[PDB]
Structures are given as structure tokens and as C-alpha cells.
RNA sequence: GAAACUGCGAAUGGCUCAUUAAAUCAGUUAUCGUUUAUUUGAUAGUUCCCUACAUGGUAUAACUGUGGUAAUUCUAGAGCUAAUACAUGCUUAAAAUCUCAGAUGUAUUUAUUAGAUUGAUGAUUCAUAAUAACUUUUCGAAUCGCAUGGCCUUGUGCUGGCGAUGGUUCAUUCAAAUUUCUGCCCUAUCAACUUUCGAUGGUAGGAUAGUGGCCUACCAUGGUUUCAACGGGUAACGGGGAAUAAGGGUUCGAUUCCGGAGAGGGAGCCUGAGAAACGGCUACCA
């Protein structure tokens, strides 16, 4: 197979975050833009943990090709992986997926309309319907 | 003309549109906190004494209980007044309020029964509205039930059966100021902390004065 | 202007934090606390930029809110907590202790210390004053007030605080020949010995300091900090020992690694 | 302001079978904006006291001062009705309330382009006919345009009060 | 966990450069002339003249129900309902000295004394203490989570953790306000300016958080000035800086940072530690 050599430099172990931070230096001659998923799988294999506590991100491909450098995360366990990863990284990886919320402008106008109504909706809706219906 | 007649004892209220202003004029030039004879309001109101408390005029303006005018005025309202809910701490606003003297300009008058006479009236005395919320604080519920201090109010408290999910799980109020072993522990802890601080500081003062005497002995 | 400011714009932050210019518009505003605004180090910078432990502010806040970080013996879970000079930062995971001291160039260098010496922390006597009810007290440089002190402790002295009882165990008296550490100015981070103290009543007291290589520099009394007796520091000195080599000598030392 | 403000009104608008996008057409002086006034009074938009003279659809200053109509102002209304007669509807129906989108066309011959636009943009047409004047030239023109556009008309015969108080028929 | 009460914030940020020429501002001083939420540390055995195993509704919101108005982040009446909201209110002896049994914590205010040659300062009436008193009464947890242990007359027992929040005062920190010295462009086709209505100073008081003509009463006749006062002009916010740059300079700097001012124009004020706030209010003008 292709000699996709994933060197890992600058390994700092911070059990403070129960984690290992490092720089990944994937050497990939004759092939471009190595896939983040296969980075995750290879790093999980090298660091003897599941491919749910390993993360890779921020990959700039070297000018000319043959090399890419990014950052890598290795949690001791999937639980703290899920606690410490940002939700966007989790969704990219395949864990709990994105929340289907409305647009920020809608949300803002929504809370702005809430800002007018004082109590709960029922005590005013009864009066409104009653009055409008006579 | 509308009238919000309310019967507070056992709880009730409802509205009467009265017309034929001839059978309205008795409610004119009447202040707030004043009693009226129901007879003039009607023969079906024989023996009703009504205490007038506020109301709304035409164009919706609430009326102020101490202005003593038959015309509406602009008044700078404050935190602890009627007709204004401050939207920010310390805010004072100028709103138009209706005067205390009731006249034809009033759309709806608000009146409460303070005496029952002749045959009862529909929807105020036949109906009875139970109080929405029973007592919650220990000594309020004690005074409501006419009990003494050492009566262990936990045994029976107002309990509402919300038969929602085929369990009929009952909810009772949480108790405030209840004599609790935890509260007693907190009180004992606070007293213990005060005494321990006092003793430790007195010991520190004694030993520092000892040091002062020792170092002044060198002369 | 109209109230205390709550933001600290980047490029207004203290220089020794070595903050990246082009990361954002703002620098971490030190919260109110023991030492000062200008001469303190926020835990955000100390945890993310000096140690590289955290990648961002969310991870710094997570580190602080899991009670890992512990400053001066207490957890200090504030994300911009003002950890200052000589403060002991104890991390239980990666069990290791830091003393936040100036480097030779004046920055807080990352300086590991041992637990047996990290038990205590040192403080400059900011004032000695007789409090209410006739109880004397000492205020140190780090905002610590200690009751019932030894009557011989005067201003500009230094005291070792146990940091578990917060009480004086031993202290150094400000006199000529005492190992002192420079806590301000151009000479910030330098270590030397007092040779002379010019008084200048009404004005600012001056002190002349002769370092281990006999270089003599004068600094105001306000930013000179005693750390003990010559050659015998009561704290763990940093790797550079505060020498302030000239640039040529520094360049030669760098070139020696070849 | 029966008029579920915008939100519940749009919620019903989602139900696209109990919505009516209709336009009112008539002769020049057949009284269509006043009928739309009486219809929009029940939406609580104008007082009853002022319905027949507050030509709410006539919005321009000229449209109000000269008692004429030039443009076509769309007004959208909320309508509640009874359960009994919604069964007597030969249309897909979901719900018991309706949203009406009414267009108030100009009657004058010089403004028939607005009537054509309203017909192109709507699907039902309310043809107002004065009982005295009957079928005039502009009502002929507007009904011809509606039938060219394939829009179903429904007819209301107006000014019966005029026929009763003036002609004594 | 809706709403609401409570608490905190909304006084930050951001924008713009209109005023402003000793003004702002820069560097440099001072607060022995003051306020300071927050943080950090320290700190309060003293209250009672028949509840403390825990007080009042003098409380109400939310919610229920009756509504007015075309409408506003409009609200009234009637029914409840809580607290670290509002208001009250004890248990801590012991050690201890003065006054003729009482008092002696702290907070406010005044007077007197000590504060030495028994602390600090260059310097005090400072810190601080004591004495004699005075308070439209300040505080001295009637507060909450999670764990449960030690003893024992085995009770509804006595003792007891880690935390949170509250709180008087002191110090500290974020600060704020005043403040010393010196330094602004053009102009004499501005040479006298100021002072009745404060101008410069003295005394006393008022007000302020504090100093001070800041205001008032009395009193003096001062104060700035050709070393350019005062006036006028600025298409003038000040600075860091920018352009050109042998040297010296000339010009720019509304504008990324610091400081100031303002929120259409003026004035006044609430709340709060902090606002003369305008995404706060009130009023006049447009
Ligand atoms: N007697 C009587 N007069 C009516 C009636 N309806 C309308 N009118 C009168 O007719 C005149 C026309 O009313 P508009 O509301 O302007 O309606 P229009 O005739 O279609 O006018 P355009 O919209 O310009 O075409 C009004 O001034 C009314 O006074 C009616 O039912 N009876
Ligand atoms: Mg300032
Ligand atoms: Mg019309
Ligand atoms: Mg006409
Ligand atoms: Mg200007
Ligand atoms: Mg500028
Ligand atoms: Mg300009
Ligand atoms: Mg600015
Ligand atoms: Mg302003
Ligand atoms: Mg404007
Ligand atoms: Mg304003
Ligand atoms: Mg603003």
C-alpha cells in the first residue's frame, strides 16, 4: 500500500483534559489530501484506542504536495472524548448529530416577540379569542 | 355600561351590561371606596350593597383611586402605584389615568358585594370557586388549620391528585420554615464556628502578648 | 468613563503575556483579585499560551471547572483569575507545581517546582499597620492580610506564608546584602544583592543592586523584592537565575548548541 | 383585529384549500370598496361606525378625496364559520376557518389594467351590480376579462336600499 | 422545567468627532483632601424585659376568573400563593474592669485624653486605644445543596463535615473623582481683561464622598497681562503615530491602541457601587 507515513510530533500529555495533543505530519507521496477519516483510523490503531477518542483537524496541505500537517487529539476514553470535543467535530466524526434549529434572525425575532408577552400565553389568549369573537 | 360584580366570599365574579342610563345614574358622582344601594341599580338587586373599587373608562384608561376628578389626567407613576408596571428598576413614567369620580365616561365599573339581601343571583352565589392554592409555609398552614406548634403538619397537607398518566400521582406543597434536622445542623454549625473562631483568636492574642512581653523583657 | 471597564483590548494587554497580535480583538481582562492588573497573569494565558495545555478558552474553562487548577492552595475556578508573582499553581493531573515568577526578560517563565517547597509561598510586606481593637497586621504584595505579626517586621521585608494556615513561618528583613529580586521596570526579572539604599524622603526610595556578576543597577524601592540571603534563596530560582546577559553573550550561548 | 396577527393567520394559510384569493369587480360607481369595507369591518380593522364611508381599500389621498379607486389594494382577512355548512362545500376542506385574500379593483375604464392584474393574480371574482343601474359597460368589461382569465364570478346585487328609498318600487 | 418573584448585569461593548485652545491631552506628581459594587485575605461569644425544634401578611407576583381600549413590553377589580423579596426577631455563658445592681461588641455623632523620648510616616489631630455621652436605629445569617458520622440518659437526643450565599469593618484589586509641574495652531485690522449677578483672597457656615468661592453671610481690594493676558478664528477632539525625509525640518494625524466628549438640541432626575445614562425616564425646542 501507499507509504502514508503519519508522523506524530510534539506530543504533550495533559490528563488535565485527560488527553494527548500532538501534530500529525502525514507524508503521502503521489496522492493528495489524505482523508480525515483514514487519519482517524490510522491514529486509533497506532495509539491503541477506539476511533472515537481520536480526532484530527486543521490540515493545511504542503505547497507542491506530498505532505500535510494538522493537529491530533487522543482521549483516554470515548466518554471524555464526547465531553471535551466541540459539537461540530463530533458531528463531523459521526457522533450525536447537528441540531435542526431555525436561522439566527428568526430566533432573534422570536425572542423579541416573546419579550412583549408578559406571562404565559393562555391567560392572554383566552381574552384575545373571547374579545375578537364577541 | 358594564359592571364587574364580584362576590369574594367563597369566590366569584361576573359582568352585567347595564343600560337605560336612567338605571345607571345612581353610580354617578360616586368616589372609590364608597357603598351604593342596589335598589336604585335594580329591583333584582334589592338588598345589595356594593363597594366600588376602580374601573375602566371608554378608551380603556384605568381609573386612579385617589385623584378625585371626573376627568382623566397625566400622572407620573412610580414603582409602588397602580396603573403602571415598571419595566426597569427605578423607572417612573407619565401615563394618563382616569379620575376617582365615576361618571358617564366610564365604560366598565368594578364593584364588590359587601352585603347580601333578597333572593340570590345566578353565577355569584350558586357557584363557588375554591381557592387556587392552599397554604405552603408551616405556620401559615398551622394558622389555617387552627393547630398548635407541636402538631407535625407533615402528616396531612393539602394534596392535589393530578390523574394524568394513569398513576394518579399526588403533589403536595414543599414546606418552608419547617423544623428540619438539616436546619438544626446548620444552626449548630454556625454557633460552633463562632465559638471556635472566638477561642482561636483569643489564644492567638494571648500568645502574641506573651511574645511582646518576652521581647520587651530584653532591655 | 461612566464605570469600570470590563474589556481589555488586545495591544493594551501587558507585554510580558506574549499574546499573538492577530488572534482576536481582545485580550483576557484580569478579574479583580490579589496582585494587580498589569503585573498579573490570567489563568487563561498561563494554561493556554504558556503551557500549551489547552487549545482554547472553552478548554481552559473546562480545566478550571473540573477543579484541576489550584492556585495558592485553592481551586480558583475563574477563567481570568489573576495569578501573580510567585503564585503556586498546583495541577493534580500531570501532578506538578509551578511558581509564577518573572524570567530574565521580565516574562513569567514556566518554572516547575517541587511539592515540599511549593507548600509555601513568599510575599513582600506591603504594609505593617495596627488594626482595629489594637490588633497589628501585615499586608503582603499578593493582597494577603495576616494578623498578629512579629513586631520586628517592617515595610519592604519579606515573609514566607505556609499557604495552608496562611501564617508566617519565617521572614527576611530588608538590609544590605540580602538576595533581592527585581519586580518592575527595565531590570524586571533580575537577581542581585542590596549594596546601598538611598532614602530620598518624600520622593521615591532608591536601591542599588549588584548581581552575581557584579553588575550594578539602581531601581526604585517599590519594585525590589527580597528572596533571602546571598547564594541561599528561600525560593526556587528560575533557570536563568536573573543574570541579564548582553545580547552578544546571549547569541553566543544560543550558537553553542550546534 | 380578529385578524390572527400574522402567525396563526399564516398557519391557516398553510392549509391552501380553505384560502380564497378573490377579487371584487363592478362598474365605475357600483359600490365595491364600500362592500369590502363592510367585509373588513368584521376583521376588526375599521370601526363599524365608520365602514361605509371609510373606504379602507381606497388608500391614496386622491382615492379618498375623490371617492374613486385607481390601484388594487390587497386586503387579507380571517374568517370563522360554523361546522354545519363546511360540510356543504364542494371543495377540499381541512379545518372550519378560512383565509380570504381580497383584491379591490378599480371600476373606472381607465384603470382596467389593475382589474386584469387582479384577475391574473386571483381565481374567484365577486361581481357587484347595482340594482338600479343593472349591467353597465364596465361590469360587462370586467366580467368579460374574468371569463377570459377563467375566473368564476359570484354576483351581489347592491344599492337595494337606494332602490327602496328613492324609487319606492 | 413555563411564567413570575428574587439576584446580578444592562454605567461594559460599539459608534462618531459636534463642542473643546491651558480646555482635553502627554509625560510627571498628590489624596496627610475622598467614594469605591466586584475580587482576595482578614475580621463580629456582648442584642434578649413569655416563638428560637425557626415569627407577620402589615403580600403579592406567577396562576384562576371578570374585563376596558383601535392600539403600546397598557392594565383594573375579585381569589389565592412563597423567599436570601418586604418586615420583624432570641438563644453565645465562660475571661473581664468602671459607675451608683448597671454597663462595657460594632455602627453614627460630638467633646476630652493617650498616642512619649508605648506603632508608622519626611510630616499630622494618622493608625489605634480609652473616657462621657448621642442615635427618625447599622450589622452581629429565622438562608440553601450534597454527605452523613462520634457519643449516648437509644429520644422528636447531644455533638458534629465539605461547600454556597449573605454580612459590619479593615486592607487589597478592578476603579473613580479631584490634583502638582511643564508643554497646544493663527491672530494686535484683539492691549488692557476680570470684579454690581464671585472676580482674587480671609473668616464662618452650607453643600459634597471629600478639598476648594463650589454656594451664601460678613470682610479686604485683589487676581491675569507685551515673557501677549483678554478677545477673535480654527474646514481644531488630544496623543501614540503618519508622509517626505544628508543633517535640521515641513505637513498630516476624523480613523485599529490610550484619554475625552456626545447620542437631534438643551435642562432635570430615578435606580444603582458606579449614569446627569438617552437600545432609562421627564419636560421645552425642532
Ligand atoms: N344607496 C346606496 N349607495 C351606495 C351603496 N353602496 C355604495 N353606495 C354609494 O356609492 C358610492 C361609491 O362607493 P365606492 O366605495 O367608492 O365604490 P365604487 O362605486 O366601486 O367606486 P370605485 O372603487 O372607484 O370604482 C359611495 O359614495 C356610496 O355612497 C348602497 O348599497 N346603497
Ligand atoms: Mg479617565
Ligand atoms: Mg372603491
Ligand atoms: Mg363620484
Ligand atoms: Mg471640530
Ligand atoms: Mg485623532
Ligand atoms: Mg470635521
Ligand atoms: Mg475611543
Ligand atoms: Mg455619555
Ligand atoms: Mg442624527
Ligand atoms: Mg441624557
Ligand atoms: Mg448606550
XYZ file of N, CA and C in Angstrom, chain D residues 24-33 67-69 104-109 111 115 126-130 132-143 156 158-159 162:
126
model
N -62.758 41.686 -6.286
C -64.094 42.255 -6.414
C -64.105 43.224 -7.589
N -65.057 43.032 -8.501
C -65.149 43.805 -9.731
C -66.585 44.265 -9.936
N -66.734 45.409 -10.593
C -68.029 46.066 -10.761
C -67.871 47.172 -11.800
N -68.928 47.960 -11.978
C -68.897 49.156 -12.805
C -68.176 50.279 -12.049
N -68.156 51.476 -12.639
C -67.394 52.586 -12.071
C -67.928 52.983 -10.701
N -69.241 53.090 -10.565
C -69.857 53.673 -9.382
C -70.822 52.677 -8.747
N -70.478 51.394 -8.808
C -71.356 50.336 -8.329
C -71.152 49.995 -6.858
N -70.223 50.655 -6.173
C -70.065 50.465 -4.746
C -69.389 49.172 -4.349
N -68.140 48.980 -4.767
C -67.386 47.788 -4.400
C -66.470 48.004 -3.202
N -65.775 49.139 -3.139
C -64.927 49.413 -1.990
C -65.731 49.577 -0.707
N -63.386 59.949 -3.932
C -64.307 58.827 -3.871
C -64.185 57.866 -5.031
N -62.972 57.673 -5.544
C -62.734 56.766 -6.654
C -61.658 55.765 -6.256
N -61.420 54.808 -7.144
C -60.389 53.801 -6.968
C -59.527 53.773 -8.219
N -59.334 44.682 -4.301
C -60.356 45.696 -4.531
C -59.977 46.438 -5.807
N -60.542 45.994 -6.924
C -60.184 46.530 -8.225
C -60.809 47.906 -8.449
N -60.209 48.720 -9.308
C -60.863 49.954 -9.748
C -61.979 49.683 -10.743
N -63.022 50.500 -10.654
C -64.150 50.362 -11.549
C -64.010 51.121 -12.853
N -63.238 52.204 -12.840
C -63.145 53.079 -13.997
C -62.506 52.363 -15.180
N -62.950 52.735 -16.384
C -62.461 52.082 -17.593
C -60.991 52.381 -17.806
N -58.684 52.330 -15.695
C -57.852 51.561 -14.782
C -58.117 50.063 -14.904
N -57.561 45.729 -12.903
C -58.502 44.618 -12.868
C -57.896 43.392 -13.538
N -65.903 38.491 -7.240
C -67.184 38.965 -6.726
C -67.648 40.132 -7.592
N -68.711 39.917 -8.358
C -69.235 40.901 -9.298
C -70.376 41.645 -8.619
N -70.135 42.912 -8.308
C -71.135 43.760 -7.670
C -71.925 44.487 -8.747
N -73.249 44.415 -8.658
C -74.142 45.023 -9.634
C -75.156 45.870 -8.884
N -75.223 47.158 -9.207
C -76.269 47.989 -8.633
C -77.615 47.569 -9.193
N -80.317 49.375 -9.482
C -80.880 50.406 -10.347
C -80.178 50.408 -11.698
N -78.861 50.611 -11.697
C -78.134 50.718 -12.956
C -77.994 49.382 -13.671
N -78.109 48.264 -12.958
C -78.067 46.973 -13.627
C -76.693 46.672 -14.192
N -76.676 46.070 -15.378
C -75.437 45.698 -16.051
C -75.011 46.851 -16.953
N -73.912 47.507 -16.597
C -73.354 48.609 -17.360
C -72.141 48.156 -18.179
N -71.487 49.123 -18.825
C -70.405 48.810 -19.752
C -69.175 48.300 -19.011
N -68.845 48.898 -17.866
C -67.640 48.465 -17.173
C -67.834 47.130 -16.484
N -69.038 46.842 -15.988
C -69.261 45.499 -15.470
C -69.217 44.482 -16.599
N -69.692 44.855 -17.791
C -69.523 43.980 -18.946
C -68.048 43.708 -19.202
N -67.233 44.763 -19.196
C -65.811 44.617 -19.489
C -65.116 43.745 -18.450
N -65.400 43.981 -17.167
C -64.706 43.235 -16.123
C -65.142 41.776 -16.121
N -66.426 41.505 -16.372
C -66.856 40.115 -16.433
C -66.271 39.432 -17.661
N -73.362 39.879 -6.454
C -74.108 40.529 -5.385
C -74.781 41.763 -5.964
N -76.365 45.213 -5.426
C -76.162 46.249 -4.431
C -77.210 47.348 -4.578
N -77.148 48.320 -3.672
C -77.985 49.518 -3.721
C -79.472 49.181 -3.700
N -81.035 52.004 -1.952
C -81.343 53.099 -2.864
C -82.611 52.812 -3.653
